[PDB]
């Protein structure tokens, strides 16, 4: 065994080794290993992406106009975000400006995805880490009603409703076909909710499973379908016609009325179901405000998103702020430049790839994706891994760094950047949440904080949906209908050689696509995706990424039942297909 120090941690692989493979209630394939000491505390953590497809290789030689459709298939959970980044990147390369309504509609697509993806995460992915579903069978339906009504104005709270939900669950389990609940962690001492809170939460899980399907109707109107809506370089394909012949063939008043109905319902559900449930999890699990901090008190990154001035990706335009903090220096938020070769770089010394020099990082315009499965001296076999060797290569995920620093990305990162830049809405939301919990600001820098920030962002994005819809309507009232710029549609109009960057904030964090075009075709297409950051393996200095750091120093009650590991990992909403692409 060995021990070394990095980023304030002592990484020590002595002691019992625990493996969690497969990690469930994430997207894609992940393996996690940890070592624990005599106190059942994690002293080493190992994040491994266990899949690869090679989109960066597949995109070579494609028409830049087609790229969005390929890269959208990086992920069907964060569906649309890679298409947005791609159209942005190609437009940046060629020098295309889209019309205002196209930008507004793209912002609507993004905000819709934030609402959907964050809602479903909270219930379907992370919820069962916090709610003991089987314990709901012990609840008193009238006390459940009283609890719910004390927390929210949401209408669906009758004792009879909770009895009905409880009976549905009782019937579901009474034949012994427990389905997704089979061999769960139910009864683990870290489940702290009373039975009535478990039944309320489970009712809400079911309501969210039903309701989430509605949110994406916005994507269907503007983008044709969800998952995997359509886009174009130059704007959007959803031509508008409000008051002329043939409006039946376009986005018309009836289509926009549908969108407005979805927005209102989405805000209502988030504000009155998800938000009070998130605060309630906080109230009953306050110790988790001090667990899973990881890098979130050291190094956090946002590129920023939601340009409100069309084609302007600067600070005055982006409604979701960008910036970086390193070394805990939150009083000095730093600007990010995605073209600067000294800022974003990826390392592969601990990943299954070849570089000419694996001791250095490569900016994505110099990126190389040359897969090389070489796990080295594993316990077991290279086709039946008992233990990865974290001193050698151990993942399909590259290791991104910002100026050489390991960063956390995602809702907590964004919230911290925006807070410290003085964004009034963020400051107010954070301050109110932490005051409600009687917790210091620092309590957000935690596993619990990641969940609270995600809920805050779902509410933020639902508000932004209305703002964007209103801006679209204002344009239509002023006779501004355009949705596509086509002057540069034809390849003869492009520079013979050009390159560009498309960036945004996906639900899980900072996303960039770097594209080089030559002779009408993609010469290079490199993606650095939020879970690539968070699930990163180590670098040549031994620095650990966000997941490994967040797992460090965590107590486990029952080593064989890894609920604490699941809680922390799920709090980041891991997307492993995203991370590896």
């Amino acid at each position: 065994s060995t021990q070394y120090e990095t980023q304030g941690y002592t990484i020590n692989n002595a002691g019992r080794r625990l493996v969690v493979d497969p990690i469930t209630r994430i997207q894609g394939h992940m393996r996690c290993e940890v070592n624990i000491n005599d106190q059942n505390v994690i002293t080493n953590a190992v994040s491994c992406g266990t899949m690869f497809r090679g989109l960066e290789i597949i995109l070579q030689g494609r028409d830049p106009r087609d790229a969005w459709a390929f890269v959208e298939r990086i992920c069907g959970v964060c569906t649309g975000v890679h298409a947005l980044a791609s159209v942005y990147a190609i437009e940046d390369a060629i020098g295309i400006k889209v019309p205002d309504n196209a930008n507004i509609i793209r912002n609507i697509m993004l905000a819709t995805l934030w609402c959907h993806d964050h809602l479903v995460h909270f219930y379907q992915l992370a919820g069962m880490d916090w709610i003991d579903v089987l314990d709901a069978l012990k609840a008193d339906p009238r006390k459940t009603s009283e609890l719910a009504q004390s927390l929210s104005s949401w209408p669906k709270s009758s004792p009879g409703y909770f009895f009905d939900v409880q009976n549905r669950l009782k019937k579901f389990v009474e034949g012994g076909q427990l389905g997704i609940f089979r061999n769960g962690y139910w009864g683990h001492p870290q489940y702290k909710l009373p039975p009535e809170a478990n039944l309320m939460g489970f009712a809400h899980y079911l309501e969210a499973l039903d309701f989430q399907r509605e949110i994406v109707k916005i994507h269907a109107v503007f983008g044709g379908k969800n998952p995997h809506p359509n886009w174009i370089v130059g704007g959007m394909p959803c031509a508008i016609n409000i008051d002329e012949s043939g409006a039946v063939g376009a986005v018309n008043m009836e289509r926009l009325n549908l969108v407005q109905s979805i927005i209102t319902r989405t805000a209502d559900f988030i504000n009155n179901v998800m938000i009070p449930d998130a605060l309630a999890i906080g109230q009953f699990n306050k110790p988790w405000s001090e667990i899973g901090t990881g890098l979130s008190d050291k190094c956090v990154l946002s590129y920023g998103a939601f340009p409100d001035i069309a084609n302007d990706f600067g600070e005055k335009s982006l409604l979701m702020p960008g910036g970086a903090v390193i070394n805990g220096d939150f009083n000095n938020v730093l600007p990010v430049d995605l073209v600067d070769p000294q800022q974003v770089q990826e390392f592969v010394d601990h990943a299954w790839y070849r570089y000419p020099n694996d001791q250095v990082g490569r900016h994505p315009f110099d990126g190389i994706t040359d897969p090389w499965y070489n796990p080295g001296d594993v316990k077991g076999s290279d086709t039946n891994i008992q233990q990865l060797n974290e001193q050698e290569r151990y993942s399909w995920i590259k290791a991104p760094r910002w100026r050489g620093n390991a960063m956390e990305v995602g809702p907590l990162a964004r919230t911290l950047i925006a807070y410290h830049k003085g964004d009034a809405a963020t400051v107010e939301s954070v301050d109110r949440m932490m005051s409600a919990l009687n917790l210091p600001l620092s309590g957000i820098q935690s596993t619990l904080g990641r969940i609270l920030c995600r809920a805050h962002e779902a509410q933020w994005a639902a508000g932004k949906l209305q703002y964007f819809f209103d801006k679209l309507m204002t344009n239509l009232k002023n006779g501004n209908l355009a949705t596509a710029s086509t002057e540069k549609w034809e390849p003869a109009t492009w520079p013979t050689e050009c390159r560009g960057v498309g960036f945004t904030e996906a639900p899980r964090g900072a996303l960039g696509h770097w594209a080089a075009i030559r002779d009408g075709k993609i010469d290079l297409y490199q993606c650095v995706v939020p879970t690539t950051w968070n699930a990163s393996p180590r670098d040549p200095k031994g620095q650990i990424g966000a997941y490994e750091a967040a797992l460090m120093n965590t107590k486990m009650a029952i080593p064989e039942q890894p609920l604490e590991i699941l809680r922390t990992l799920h709090s980041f909403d891991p997307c492993l297909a995203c991370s590896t692409h």
Binding site: M51, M128, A220, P227, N230, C238, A239, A250, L258, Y373
Partner: protein
Amino acid sequence: KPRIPVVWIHGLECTCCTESFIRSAHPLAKDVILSLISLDYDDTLMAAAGTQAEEVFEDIITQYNGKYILAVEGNPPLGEQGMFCISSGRPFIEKLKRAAAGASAIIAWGTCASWGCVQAARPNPTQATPIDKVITDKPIIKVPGCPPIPDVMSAIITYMVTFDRLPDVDRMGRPLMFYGQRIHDKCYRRAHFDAGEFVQSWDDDAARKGYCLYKMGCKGPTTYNACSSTRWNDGVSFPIQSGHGCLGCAENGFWDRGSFYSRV
């Protein structure tokens, strides 16, 4: 009254097929899971992880050997000894073969499981391979599309449960009910196609009147699916209705059949 056991596994995939399933409007996915099937294994939704999830997989495929439906999302890579997709420290293809051996029938959800989809597009770095090229001794129902339509997925499930049989299929294994006709055989813009009324550039006057998308690369003429009839997301839209031509996403090899914007 026990519900039919279903084991849903994931190879290399983006999860669009799982996501589509949960969009179902009728029956709600909630009602499918609670009342129509027993969803006994599913990495995206299940509580158990790691060794607990492995225990569930082993128990289910043993107890219900010969009796469970296997749903497959994604596909196996043959490159690097299969270690481009690793589950429980071993190549995913081993999990696929074990699950397949006990299944009464297999549903290949989506273009990934049916044909290969994006990872199998040139130059197919991982040697991603559709499941009927690996599993050759079991009924496989292909339900293609990237992803398939939500209410098509749930209709196929309800058909199988209600009627206690597999849907009748074409020679490629696709359910005739939803894949027997082409998009262009039921497209509401066919009047324009017939008249030679086409969109020529995005957002032109033709586009604002809903003219045909053939000259913009629509692949509806060569693509079998239900999008133009059943539509997407509780019937709200489909690609062409919202102004983009069909990509051809339900067809084998559609990524490599030229640019999306090249005419069919």
